[PDB]
Amino acid sequence: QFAKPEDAVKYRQSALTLMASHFGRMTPVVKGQAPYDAAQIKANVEVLKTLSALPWAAFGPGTEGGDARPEIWSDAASFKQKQQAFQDNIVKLSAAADAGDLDKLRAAFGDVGASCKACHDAYAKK
Amino acid sequence: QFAKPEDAVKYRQSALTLMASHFGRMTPVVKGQAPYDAAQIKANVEVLKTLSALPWAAFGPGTEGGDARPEIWSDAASFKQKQQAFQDNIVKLSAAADAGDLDKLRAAFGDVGASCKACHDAYAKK
């Protein structure tokens, strides 16, 4: 869907910005600093689910640019493992949200965050 | 979810960028320049549905900035009519996609596009 590599870069950066907001806005809730409304969180995690599937198709070959490290492309398999594993942590977060299980939500939220950082430390430029 | 108005601006711009890509990538399909795969289009319009609900909550009072015209805030009701009407055009597009009805998809796509432009001509800076 991208006319030039720059369009893929802009798309993925925008998608990642939106995940970050839908993930990070729950921090006060998981810390207990803001109240826990199970329905609110269920709905927000559904949005996050949708968004978390979107970036990867915008790292399609030849789309070097942005702050993407080149290693995304020279080992397609390891990067794919990374994103698929991240998405499966999102599945655990969805399960916790759908169950209205706060304890499970806290644990899943931490594991998701660790997954974000694991990818950045291998694949995003400093 | 925004610490400063700039964060709302960045969110909405990113959300709008993603809609634009999920909307515009269907142009070749509705023109017949690319093939019509009903399942592909159904799935893409579901993504567009999700995305098309997101920008509006990031124009929450005091978030002047970006290329948003000030009139978004001085008449909350007219802007709301605009976004809600846009979202209902998205509903028609979803119905057409879910039905696998190409003719309906073409018509709905044009009406969605007109709705985007109607909002821009009142509420986005040139």
Ligand code: HEC
């Ligand atoms: C690899 C499998 C990743 C996972 C999982 C997550 N992110 Fe990431 N992110 C990744 C790359 C390669 C990049 C650079 C993209 C580019 O081309 O520049 C990024 C970038 C971001 C950004 C900045 C986006 C921008 O505006 O430029 C943010 C805010 C971000 N990532 C957030 C984020 C969060 C919160 C994640 C887990 C919920 C997450 N990312 C996962 C690679 C990967």
Ligand code: HEC
């Ligand atoms: C009002 C109800 C709108 C409707 C419907 C659509 N858009 Fe729009 N758009 C609107 C505003 C007020 C702005 C400015 C936002 C800001 O603070 O700068 C925009 C902007 C965009 C952009 C640019 C985003 C960026 O990267 O800065 C794009 C690509 C865009 N809009 C696309 C777009 C499409 C394709 C729409 C219909 C499918 C659509 N918008 C509807 C207001 C409104």
